[PDB]
Amino acid sequence: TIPHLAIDPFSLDFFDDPYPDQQTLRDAGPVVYLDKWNVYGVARYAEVHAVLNDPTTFCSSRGVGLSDFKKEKPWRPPSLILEADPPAHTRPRAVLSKVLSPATMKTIRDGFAAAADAKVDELLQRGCIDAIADLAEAYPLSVFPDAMGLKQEGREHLLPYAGLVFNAFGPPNELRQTAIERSAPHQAYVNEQCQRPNLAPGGFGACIHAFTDTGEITPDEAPLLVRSLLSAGLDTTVNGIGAAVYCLARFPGELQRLRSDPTLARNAFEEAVRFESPVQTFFRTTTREVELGGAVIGEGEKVLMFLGSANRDPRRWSDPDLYDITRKTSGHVGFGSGVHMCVGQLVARLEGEVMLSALARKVAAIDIDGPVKRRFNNTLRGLESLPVKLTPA
Ligand code: HEM
Numbered sequence: 001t002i003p004h005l006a007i008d009p010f011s012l013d014f015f016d017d018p019y020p021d022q023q024t025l026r027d028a029g030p031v032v033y034l035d036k037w038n039v040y041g042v043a044r045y046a047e048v049h050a051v052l053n054d055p056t057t058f059c060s061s062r063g064v065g066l067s068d069f070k071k072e073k074p075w076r077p078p079s080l081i082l083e084a085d086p087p088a089h090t091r092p093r094a095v096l097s098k099v100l101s102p103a104t105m106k107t108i109r110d111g112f113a114a115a116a117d118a119k120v121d122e123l124l125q126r127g128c129i130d131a132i133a134d135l136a137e138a139y140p141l142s143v144f145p146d147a148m149g150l151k152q153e154g155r156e157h158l159l160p161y162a163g164l165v166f167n168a169f170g171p172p173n174e175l176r177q178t179a180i181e182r183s184a185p186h187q188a189y190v191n192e193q194c195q196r197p198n199l200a201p202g203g204f205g206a207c208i209h210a211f212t213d214t215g216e217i218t219p220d221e222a223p224l225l226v227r228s229l230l231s232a233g234l235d236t237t238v239n240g241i242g243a244a245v246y247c248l249a250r251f252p253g254e255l256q257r258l259r260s261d262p263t264l265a266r267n268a269f270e271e272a273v274r275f276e277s278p279v280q281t282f283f284r285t286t287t288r289e290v291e292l293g294g295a296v297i298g299e300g301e302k303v304l305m306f307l308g309s310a311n312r313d314p315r316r317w318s319d320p321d322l323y324d325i326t327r328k329t330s331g332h333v334g335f336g337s338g339v340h341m342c343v344g345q346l347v348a349r350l351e352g353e354v355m356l357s358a359l360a361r362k363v364a365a366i367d368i369d370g371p372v373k374r375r376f377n378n379t380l381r382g383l384e385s386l387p388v389k390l391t392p393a
Pocket residue numbers: 060064081082083093096100228229232233234236237239240241273277278279282307333334335336337339340341342343344345347348
C-alpha cells in the first residue's frame with residue numbers, strides 16, 4: 001500500500017534542485033517508503049505537522065538523524081534538548097526558553113540592530129560583495145559569538161563544527177563520514193567553551209550556567225545546553241539570512257515593497273524561512289505501531305520529515321513557490337512545530353528582522369553579478385557564495 005521510491009533525499013542532485021523530487025514525494029502518497037535508506041518519508045504539510053505534534057509516538061530520544069540510538073552509538077553525547085523526549089526534555093527546554101527570552105531580546109536588540117546597520121553601511125562602501133561570506137556569515141559572526149559570551153580566539157571553529165553537526169544527522173554518505181573524519185579539533189574547542197569559566201558574564205552561556213540551581217537543570221547539564229546553542233544557533237541564522245537576501249535578489253518586486261514599508265522586515269524574513277527552509281529535514285523514530293495517513297508504520301522505524309517540502313505543499317499554501325513578504329506565514333514548519341519548536345526562534349527572528357530592516361532603509365537594488373554556488377549539507381539548505389552588487393538608496 002505504501003509506495004516505494006528510489007529518490008535519495010541526501011544526494012547532491014537532490015540538494016542541487018529538490019523541488020521536483022519533493023513534488024514526486026508529496027504526490028506519491030501521504031506516506032512513502034525510501035528504499036535507498038530503509039526509512040519512511042512524509043512530504044506533505046498535513047503528515048509533517050502531525051508527526052511533529054505527536055512526540056510520544058514519533059520520539060526524538062532515539063535520534064533525529066538517520067541513526068537509531070537504540071542500534072548505534074551517537075557520534076557525540078546526545079543533546080539534552082533536541083535528542084530528548086518529555087519529560088526529560090521539559091525542564092532543559094524551560095531553561096533555554098528563559099535564557100533566550102523576550103527580556104533577553106530586549107537587552108540585545110539595540111546592539112543587534114546597530115551591527116546590522118553598520119554592516120550594511122560597510123558593504124555599501126564596497127558595492128560588490130559576497131552576500132554569504134560578507135553578509136549572511138559576517139553579520140551573525142559579529143553578534144552571536146559575543147551574545148554567547150565567547151572569547152575571541154577560536155571562533156573560526158564555530159561554522160565548521162555546526163556544519164559537521166548538521167551533516168551528521170544524515171545517512172552515512174561521504175558528506176557525513178568526511179565531516180566526522182575532520183571533527184576532532186572543532187569538538188575540542190566547542191566542548192571547552194561550554195565550561196562556565198570560559199563564558200563571559202551576562203551572555204547566553206553564562207546565563208545557562210546561572211540557571212543550574214533552580215531544580216530545573218544541574219551544573220553537569222549546563223555545558224551540553226551551551227553546546228546546543230553553539231551547534232544550532234549560528235549556521236541556521238547564516239542560512240536563514242542568506243535565504244532572505246537570495247529571495248530579495250531573485251524577487252526584485254518584493255525588495256521594492258520591503259523598501260516602501262520597512263516594518264515588513266520581520267515577515268519578509270519569516271517568509272524566507274518558509275520559502276527556503278534552511279533546515280530541510282529531520283527524523284523521528286516510532287515508539288509503537290502507528291497508523292499515519294492510512295499507512296501502518298511499525299515500532300522502531302525511522303520517519304523522515306521533509307520540512308521544506310511541507311512549506312511548499314500546495315495543499316496547504318496558495319502559490320507556495322512564490323516569495324511573498326505579506327504572506328500569512330503562520331503555521332509554516334521552518335522552525336519545527338510542537339514541543340521542540342525552535343527554542344532560539346526569537347534570536348533568529350531578531351537577527352533576520354534587523355538585517356532586512358537595514359537593507360530596506362539603505363539599499364535600492366540587489367543584483368546578482370557573479371556565479372551562484374550552492375553549499376551542500378545533509379540537513380541545511382543554503383548557498384556557498386552569492387555575488388551581488390548593492391545599490392545604495
Ligand atoms: C533561521 C534560523 C533557524 C532555523 C531555520 C531553525 C530551525 C529549527 C528547527 C526546525 C527545530 C526543530 C527540531 C526538531 O523538531 O527536532 C529547531 C529547534 C531548536 N533550535 Fe532552531 N532554528 C534557527 C535558529 C536557531 C537559533 C538562533 C538558536 C539558538 C540561539 C536555535 C536553537 C535551537 C534549539 C536548541 C533547538 C532544540 C529545541 C528543542 O528540541 O526543544 N535555533 N530549530
